[PDB]
Structure formats: C-alpha cells, structure tokens
Symmetry: D3
Subunit: 185 residues, 6 copies
C-alpha cells in the first residue's frame, strides 16, 4: 500500500516547481488532479452544480474516487492543497503525511510571484496580503522545507519521500519476500 | 538533538555505515559502549568500546550508571547514561549502536528515540561479511550466525529499515532518514526560529 | 565507432523509464525507434515511440530485408530498421535497442560486439503493479503478459549485465555506470582521446 | 567469487590516491600489500604500504614459488604474494593489485578473468608536477621511463584519465560498479532474488 | 539585482544542450529569447526558442533601439531585446544570453559586470561529429562552419571562464559550479541574506 | 602557478572541519601550517596542526622577516611562513591560509590575486553550541564584522551543503581563463592549430 502526501505552500513559494522535479525522478509517485474554477484533465479538472453533487475549499476540490484506488494499488500520491484541505484530509485520513514549503523571506515570495509572470501587478499584492496568514499554518505540518536554493530544497523533499518508503509499513509491503527469506531457518 | 538507535544482526554493516555517516555529519555523535567482550585486532579502547572486566562492568551496573545493558553473545554490553544526558543537552545528535534488548530499554525510557534496523540482502551475506571482516574467529561467527535469525526477527520493532546491499545506496538511505528528521516540524522550528518569525511579521 | 546496446526486460520492469532518464543526461546516446504492428497506447506518438504500421506493410518491409531483427511479441510484430542502425553507428553515436529476447538473440548473432543489459523487477508482483500503475494497457493485455513474465525473465542469463530496478534512482545510477564504464574501454578511449594519447607518448 | 583488479599507471599519475578514495567507499574491495626491496618513504609503514624485505629474502621467496608475479621496477624488486591473493578471492572479496605492466602480463596469463585499468595523466608535464609536488632525483630516472610505462596502456581493459580528481574517481567507481553488475557477479550476489523471480 | 551571463561557443560545442540542462535544475535563472531572421527549423516555437521575425521587422525594431545587442551570424540577424533584459535583471532574476562573440563584446561594453562563459569541444573533430549528430545543418554548412571553427574558437580568450564540454555530465557540473560560486560572492550573499547577516552582527 | 586562498571564520564556525573535508577530495590543494605561540590542543602535533614555538622564537622569526603575515589573535601570536607559501605556489599547487581578518588584509596587500572566503554560522548561538559542544564570543561579532572584506561567503548551516558551496568556489576558480589556459595549454593549442 502507498502513502498519501499533503504538500502545501503560499503561491510563489516554489511548490509547483519542486513537485514537478520530484516526479521526474520518482515514477512510483503520482499527483492528484484537482477540480478548480493549461489542459483540462492534466493540470486540473476544470461547474459548481456538478461539484455540489459530489475535500474541497474556496481560496477548488479533490476528487475522492481517484485517491482510494490509487493508494490501494501501492502508488504514492501527492495532494497540492491549502491548509483547509489539509485539515480536512488529516481528519478523514489521519495517516496522511503533510509537507509545508516556505520561502526564505517575504520579499523572495513577492519576487517569485512577480517573476513567474502569471499573476497581475496587483494580484501579487492581493495574494501577499493573505500570504502571511496562509504561512502561519506551517505549524500543522509534519515537515518543513525552506525553498531557498532550489537544488537543496529538492534534495530535502526527496529525503522526506525516501525516508517514508523506508518506514516499517512501506518496507513490509515492498520487501515482503526478502524479509521472508531472511527469517527462513 | 535527536537520539538514534541503530541495530542490526552482527555483520550487517552497521558500524561501517555509521562511520561513513559521521564523516559528513559533524553534528552527530556515536556512543562508546562498555563491553566485556575481548578486543578485536585493530580496535582501540576508548574509541570503539570501553573494554572493562566483568567484575567492574557489574560494579558499574550496581552504581546504576547504565542507561541500558544487555547480555549479547555471551558478553555484557551497556551504554553510559551520563554521557547520553549531556550530549543531547548540548544540541548534538546521538547514535546508540546497540542490540534489540538495549533498543527496547531505550524506547521505554525515551519514547521520542528514533530506531533504525539495518538488514543484509541475505543470510549468507552476514556470514561472508563476518568472515570478510576478519576480526572474529569461527566459534564466534558460528555462535552469532545461529542467533542471526533471532536478531533479525525484532526488525518489526524499528521505525525504519535499511537494507545494506550496495554500501553507497544504503549510506544514501541512511542519510535520507537523518535528513528527514532534521526537517520535522520540531527541528525546523528550533533551527529556523528567527527566519520563521520574520516570515510571519 | 559508437556502441550498440541491447536493453531488454519483462513488460513493466521499467526499461523505457530508465532509458529515457539516461538519455536526458547522455546526448551522445540515441534510442532506436522500432516498427510495430501493435496499436498505439494512450500518449504514444507515431515516429517517437514506434513506427506504427500494418501487418502487411511490416511483412513487406521484412520481405525487402529492411529489418536488422524482427520478432512476434505478444501477438504483434516488432522490428528494428537496419538502415537507421548502420547510419547511426557509423556517425560515432551510441545506440540503444529496446527489444525483446528474441530480437536480442538475432542482434547478437549479426553483431557480436553488441552490449546487452537486462532489467529485472524486485518481484513478480512488482511487474503487475507497475503494468497496472502505468495505465497504458488493458487488464487482458496485462494478464497475457504476466502469464509469460517468468518465461520472459528466464532469458536474463543471456545478457552481459543485470540491473535490479528496485529503487528507480539507484537503478538509474547502475545503468549510467554500465554505460560510463563502456566508454572507458580501450577501444572507445583510443578513438575519443586519440590526440591526447599521442601527446602523452611523444618525447 | 570476487574480481581481481590490476591497476597500473606511470609513477605519479595518481593511482594510490585514487585507490585510497575508492577503498573508503567500497568495503568489499581490498588492496594487495606488495613486497619490495626498497627503502621507506616519509610516512610509509611496513606491512601497510609494502612488505619491506631485503633482496635476499625476496629471491628466496621467489624460489619457493610463493609469488603470483614479480618484476624489477628501477632495479628494485617488487612482487605479489600468491597465498594472499588466492585466499582473498575465495572469500568473495574484490582485490586490487597496484603493479606495473610486467606484472599485469604475468597475471593476465594465469588469470584471464583479471580486469586491468590504466590510469593516465592529462599530460606528461602534469606527471612531473605530481611526482615533484607529492614529496618523495628519482623523478629524472622515472621520467625517462614514464613514456615507456605509459606505452603499455594498449594492454589494459579500461583507461582512466586522471585530470580532475573527482571526475576520475567517479570514472573509477563506474568501472567497479559495472563489474559488479555483470552476469556472473549478479548471479552470485542475487541468487535468491533470481530464484523467486523464476518460481 | 540579478547577474547577466554571456554563454558563447562555436556551433556544435554543446552550448544549447548544456544551458537547457542547467535551466531544468535552476528556476532562478532565465534565458533570453532572442529575435532572429533565420528560418524556423522544425520543433522550434516562436516565443520559445526564438522570436522569429523577418529582416524588415528586425531592422525596424533596431531603429526603435529595442535591442541591447545585435549581430549578423552566418548571414542572418540576431539580437537581444533590451527591455526584457533590463526588466528581468531588475526583478532580481539571473539571465543567460546565448549569443556569439560579436554580441558578447557589445554587452561587455554596456554592461562590464556581465559574466561570460566560453564552451569548447574536446577536439575539432568532435565538433564536426556533433554538428553531424545534431542533424540540423547541411554538409555544405557544416564544412563552412568548420572553416570558421578555429576563428570562432580563437575568441575564447575574451571570456571569464572556459568549460570544456567533453563528458556532458562533467561539463554540466562545471557550469553549475560557476553559477553557484557567483551566487556566493559578497554582493549576492549580502543582498539575499541581508537580514540573517544583521542578526549575526547584533 | 597555483591559487592562494584565504579562508577565515570566527572561532567555531566550522572552517577547519570544512577545509579538512575539501582536502580529502582535492589533492592539488594544500593547507598552510601556521606558526603560533598558543599551546598544543587535544590531539595537536607540532608540524601538523601548527608549528608550535614560543613568543620569543616567534618574534625572532619576525625580526628575520620570515613571515608573510602575522597577527595577535585572542592574546596569542600567529603567523604564516613566507618560504613555504612561495615554493608551494611555484610548484603549481593551490594553497589555503586559515587566518584571521588581520592576516587576510596583509596577504591581500602583498598578493591581491588571493581569493578570500569567509565562513559564517547560521546564528550567533550556533557558534556557542559549536564551540561548547566541540572570551571569543564577545569578540566573535567583531571578527564577523570583517565579512564584508571577503570575495565569497559560505553559510555553514548544513555541513554537506556548505561543503558543496566550498567545492563550487574552488572548481569555478579553476575554470577561469588564466587557470584553464595553464592547465589545458596543449588542448587549446590543438584546437587552434
Ligand atoms: N528556490 C527558488 N529560488 C528562486 N526562484 C524559485 C525557486 N523555486 C522556484 N522559483 C521560481 O518561483 C516562481 C514560483 O514558483 P511556483 O512553483 O510556480 O509557485 P507555487 O508555489 O505557487 O506553485 C517560479 O518562477 C519558479 O521558477
Ligand atoms: N554493503 C556491503 N557489502 C559488502 N560488504 C559490506 C557492506 N557493508 C559493510 N560491509 C563489510 O562487512 C563487514 C561487516 O561490517 P560491520 O559494520 O563491521 O558490521 P556490524 O553490522 O556487525 O557492525 C565489514 O568488513 C564491512 O566493511
Ligand atoms: N523502480 C520503480 N518503482 C516503481 N515504479 C516504477 C519503477 N520504475 C519504473 N516504474 C513505473 O513502472 C511503469 C512501467 O515502466 P516502463 O518503463 O514504462 O515499463 P517497460 O519496462 O515495459 O518499458 C511506469 O509507470 C513507470 O513509471
Ligand atoms: N588528479 C590529480 N590532480 C592533481 N594531483 C593529483 C591528482 N591525483 C593525485 N594527485 C597527487 O599526485 C601525487 C602522486 O599521487 P600518487 O597516488 O601518490 O601517485 P602514484 O600514481 O605514483 O601512486 C600525490 O601528491 C597526489 O596527491
Ligand atoms: N559532451 C557532449 N558529447 C557529445 N555530444 C554532445 C555533448 N554535448 C552536446 N552534445 C550534442 O552535440 C550536438 C550539438 O549540441 P548543441 O547544444 O545543440 O550545439 P550548439 O553548441 O550549437 O548550441 C547535440 O546533438 C547535442 O546533443
Ligand atoms: N554545519 C555544522 N553544523 C554543526 N556543527 C558543525 C558544523 N560544521 C562544523 N561543526 C562542528 O563545530 C565544531 C567547530 O568546528 P571547527 O572547524 O573545528 O571550528 P573552527 O571554525 O574554529 O576551525 C566542530 O565540533 C565541528 O564538527
Ligand atoms: N483545498 C484545495 N486546495 C487546492 C486544490 N488545488 C489547489 N489548491 C490550492 O489552491 C491555491 C491556489 O492555487 P492556484 O490558484 O495557483 O491554482 C494553492 O494554495 C493550492 O494549493 C484542491 O484540490 N483542494
Ligand atoms: N544493548 C547493547 N548492545 C550493544 C552495546 N554496544 C554494542 N551492542 C551490540 O552488541 C552486539 C555485538 O557487537 P560486537 O561484539 O560485534 O561489537 C551488536 O548487536 C551491537 O549492536 C551496548 O552498549 N548496549
Ligand atoms: N524484437 C523486438 N522486440 C521489440 C522491439 N520493439 C519493442 N520490442 C519489445 O516488445 C515488447 C513489448 O513492448 P511494448 O508493446 O510494451 O512496447 C518489449 O519487450 C519490447 O522490448 C523491436 O524492434 N524488436
Ligand atoms: N610487478 C609489480 N609491480 C609493483 C608491485 N608493487 C608495486 N609495483 C609497481 O612499482 C612501481 C613503483 O612504485 P613505487 O616505488 O612508487 O611504490 C609502480 O608502477 C607500481 O605499480 C608488485 O607487487 N609487482
Ligand atoms: N549576437 C547574437 N548571437 C546570437 C543570438 N542568438 C543566438 N546567437 C548566436 O547565433 C549563432 C547561431 O545559432 P543558431 O542558428 O544555431 O540558433 C550561435 O553562435 C548563437 O550563440 C543573439 O541574440 N545575438
Ligand atoms: N593572522 C593569522 N591568524 C591565524 C593564523 N593561524 C590561525 N589564525 C587564526 O587564529 C584564530 C584562532 O584559532 P585557533 O586558536 O582555534 O587555532 C582563528 O580565527 C584562526 O583563523 C595565522 O597564521 N595568521
């Protein structure tokens, strides 16, 4: 069986860039396709009536069907969700692992938001007003990655995922046969 | 700092993997156990072990100076409690290279202790490594091989398992565990308290 | 001249993923685009993953002796174009053939200097799980290939090197070491560093 | 069993330092302690770097057929103990012989499975700098023979160019890891995994 | 403020693939999309590899003084948009110009703090093989570019750093080491860790 | 000709341990054995860690102009032997001087091509922890205030990351025109022939 990961970060901290690089070196890991209001089905399932017909939050929603089958197949799964979703998932599925990604400074956040070139010259300040409040939830997460130097932060992220696959539970499923041979007198 | 328990059947590679880990990790220390085992060729008293006699090991035990002690392969081993208390209080990380009996004692007293079990890729690999090390006779290698399955059966009591097949890959596995812990909420809050404060300011 | 590599594995072992990651760091290496009569998987592009053809046009290409090797694999035909292999090697490029054990045997007979690497899973269940998790094949196809998995893996004894693809990053390093070690052989080093060697022995 | 390696190089190419770094990361690899009829260098320890013996005890050891190979390198005699090599391989350990081209030819005759690696400098002048900068007259005797030593590079399975040390160390590690990935080594090391895969 | 990098190389040395590999691991670094009059080879997208325009639109852009530098390379016009460079450096981003030696000299005059890196092949023949292996140049053009190879490579003396692109991965590491050492300079470390440094001196 | 490096740091920042790890992977690099009037430390060997002499023999060595630089640090005299530096550089080896900011200024005057690196801790308490776990703390801020005088700054937070930073500085310096022109003269000649 696989691990459920929650990855959260303020916009522009580097969560998208770190996860994409993590996936390139981690074939057993998938990323959940959120529904939100780019390619439909790849980045997101791109309305409210279908959503009301059945975690979810306004800041967006995570499809429940994909998660259940994926974990039972042994795949690890990353949810790129906000603190509201993280709280919902942690309540419904307490075994979920949570990782928070933070910038080295508030100004680096603004520079990255501005340098990404996807938001407006005022939405950067609109998102920054909520950025300090959003980052305050870092205390609710199992691990913290400070995305200063990208390469080091990628290593930090890979170490979390590798250490997790080395846990007792994961090693028992993946290396069951080796463990059996080791104890076979 | 963090207290680590590293255990393994005799000859899995626990000593050599930890030695290499320390070369890149000055903030981590390894505890020097007391033993009544006889010195191996190439071993130095005070570095690898505190080589003491049985009468004084038991004298040290009667003074309750041991955080844990156990009988392993017919010899007495124990961890000095004073050295552990001071080392953790200075902020250094600390590795105990002890058996499952010591591991259980330590886990009861310090539930936050992190435990790692190192496994060989096969049983025969243990005998080969014990033989290739060349520090132990055949009577000792055959005594430890009989208990090897018994030693490995406690692996289910450990937080993480490292399979020491290829040395460099297993060192990477080990470094990933130590790095993931240093990235936990508690460690990150202590280490980056000032940076975190500026972020919420 | 470049080196011809044969990379084989039971379906779902990770051979395509490992080779793709190898190529991102290895510009001197090319991978052969095989012909197949199989239908496309979701996300496959004609000319990139395979040259998709009909049975008829495959057998016509075969009657013209345009295949270095060919084989029937899980009910479909696959084959390596001979012209492309010859031209690439003569340019000094290294070349990977991602082919089955039947094709590998044909290539070894025609080109004895070819290097072969076999990629094994850590378990049989790992193959089924990886085939299922890739999501490009149906269930009947997966079961059909899993039925032959033990028979397929039995040919590992015919290969020069074995890579156990347990941890992907570790298996990628193992693969890079085989390639890097081949480029350090006497022949490759003599061709690539002919001038430096000449400077070294001149008094 | 393990792999027998022959590592050769003109004096000062970096063979000892590259092997030392390789040994620090490769516990399954041992390096042979050769016998020599030579005087220690500042820092050398008898039994670690060499078995320092006289020319009398060397030829007597030779007459007893105790050497796997022997050769004269600058009038000084060097040789590898056959007992030590035979014992180490049978335990499954890999073994490095740091010997010249003469020993390599002898070992290749007795053990065709031996792997040979020749370590080259980026230039002839870099050889002089490394010989001089290390800190052990002989350089002029060895530099005349350096071209002679390097000309035998054509006899070796692999060539490592020791230009940048770290890159040359990676090159060296790639050879050793690729060798452990060969059919024979993998068959011994993962016999149990292979059995489960075919069952 | 970010750092301006000039990366140059004779055709086929490996400059495009080495920078592409460096960028995949370095999000704080951007590469300038030059304007060119050359024809759009397959696989290239206007706005991705180049801003493909005609000679007429290029010279009109030049008359509007919208280029930081421009040069004729192998009969076509190439140029770096000055507005994009100025804004990108002012945002604190690092910037690579993959330009020839002519553009590099122009950039050095207007921006003497620009960092320049020259990439070299391990041999002239390796250059010919790589041009042939890339498969995007007639044999006539290859023979012509090899005639200019020695003249082009002679400009290596104008560059701060030389990377010999022999083994790709080793040359990629060399390049990353240059970039990492630059971000460790007094000025860069002072800007990025100004607050941490303040805590140290209190 | 090799490169002369100046590596400085407040006491306990990690300069000696980082340089030791760098040297294990850099055989072309040497570290200068300074003269000092301080007494031997745990495990210190005369000629290895320092050339331990007395204040009287140090000042005599100074009057003979045998030093490249000298300074009083924390109440003890320290100095670099000039002959060893000159010979080492002329042999083509790179050279590290583990000296304080006073020595760094003297060396920069005599050899302005010297590369200087300052190693900083992640926090002021980390120094106390590193010094304690392994008087100077009051002067630590004073020593660190000279960081502005150095070409490169390495923040020794995570040891392995700081080691990588240090290796990148040394590797980039060997990628400079002057260094590459000396080291690959024959290759460059072959390319331009
Ligand atoms: N460590 C880093 N240093 C500098 N820029 C970075 C770093 N990591 C990411 N970036 C850049 O910051 C911007 C925001 O990153 P992104 O992952 O898209 O944000 P988000 O956290 O909202 O998913 C991008 O342009 C990215 O390239
Ligand atoms: N992955 C490995 N492969 C082969 N030999 C190894 C490996 N790891 C360690 N060794 C060797 O096995 C022997 C036993 O290792 P050691 O750490 O001393 O055992 P222990 O687990 O009892 O502390 C040593 O000679 C060591 O060098
Ligand atoms: N070591 C691994 N662990 C888990 N999944 C892996 C590993 N290597 C590859 N995979 C995944 O297994 C699936 C099958 O891999 P692929 O290379 O396409 O198979 P094939 O060997 O048939 O070419 C893919 O989804 C791939 O991402
Ligand atoms: N790649 C290298 N570049 C520069 N100096 C090196 C390199 N490798 C080794 N050296 C140095 O060259 C000298 C000769 O190395 P050594 O291993 O002792 O020589 P040998 O090849 O004769 O065994 C030593 O001082 C060593 O530190
Ligand atoms: N070190 C290398 N060894 C072999 N081939 C390489 C190396 N680096 C790049 N190549 C290949 O050489 C060709 C030319 O590289 P490219 O970057 O496109 O050239 P340019 O220098 O003109 O930008 C490409 O096919 C590339 O994959
Ligand atoms: N990054 C680090 N994190 C934690 N401890 C470190 C780090 N780097 C070095 N140390 C330790 O700090 C102590 C002081 O290091 P050292 O190099 O001896 O100091 P100095 O800068 O005075 O030469 C040593 O015990 C060393 O192992
Ligand atoms: N709760 C929840 N948050 C999501 C989901 N998908 C994205 N988000 C969050 O929505 C925020 C805005 O992201 P963006 O606007 O770039 O798409 C991010 O913080 C992201 O983590 C989802 O499925 N559920
Ligand atoms: N409980 C306990 N076990 C120890 C201690 N020191 C070493 N051991 C264990 O004793 C066993 C025998 O080790 P050896 O004789 O090879 O040194 C190993 O499993 C080792 O981990 C100690 O202080 N306490
Ligand atoms: N003989 C041969 N086998 C091939 C060729 N191309 C693919 N195969 C093999 O056919 C099998 C099925 O591959 P698939 O349909 O999953 O892509 C794999 O083992 C693959 O290596 C080819 O050109 N020749
Ligand atoms: N044939 C042979 N050569 C040796 C032996 N030991 C060292 N050599 C070679 O003797 C030469 C001189 O080495 P040195 O004097 O620096 O130790 C080197 O080329 C080294 O490889 C040995 O046992 N046999
Ligand atoms: N001066 C200048 N040269 C450029 C520019 N863009 C590309 N080049 C150079 O033009 C040459 C031809 O490149 P290509 O035709 O392969 O894209 C290369 O040397 C490349 O570095 C530019 O904006 N300015
Ligand atoms: N100027 C100068 N400072 C030195 C020299 N050797 C050591 N130091 C500095 O003296 C200080 C005290 O170092 P320690 O007492 O731990 O050896 C350190 O900052 C060290 O850099 C030297 O030769 N010259």
């Amino acid at each position: 069986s696989g691990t459920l990961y929650i990855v959260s970060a303020p916009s522009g901290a580097g969560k998208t860039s770190l996860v994409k690089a993590l996936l390139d070196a981690a074939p057993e890991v998938r990323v959940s396709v959120s529904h939100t209001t780019e390619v439909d089905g790849v980045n997101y399932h791109f309305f409210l009536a279908m959503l009301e017909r059945n975690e979810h939050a306004e800041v967006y929603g995570t499809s429940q069907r994909w998660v259940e089958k994926t974990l039972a197949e042994g795949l690890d799964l990353i949810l790129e969700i906000d603190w509201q979703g993280a709280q919902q998932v942690r309540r419904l599925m307490p075994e979920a692992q949570s990782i928070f990604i933070l910038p080295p400074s508030q100004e680096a956040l603004r520079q990255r938001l501005t340098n990404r070139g996807q938001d407006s010259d005022e939405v950067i300040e609109r998102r920054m007003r909520e950025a300090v409040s959003e980052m305050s939830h870092y205390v609710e997460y199992d691990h913290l990655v400070i995305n200063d130097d990208f390469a080091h932060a990628l290593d930090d992220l890979k170490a979390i995922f590798r250490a997790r696959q080395l846990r007792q539970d994961a090693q028992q499923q993946r290396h069951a046969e080796l463990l059996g041979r080791l104890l076979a007198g």
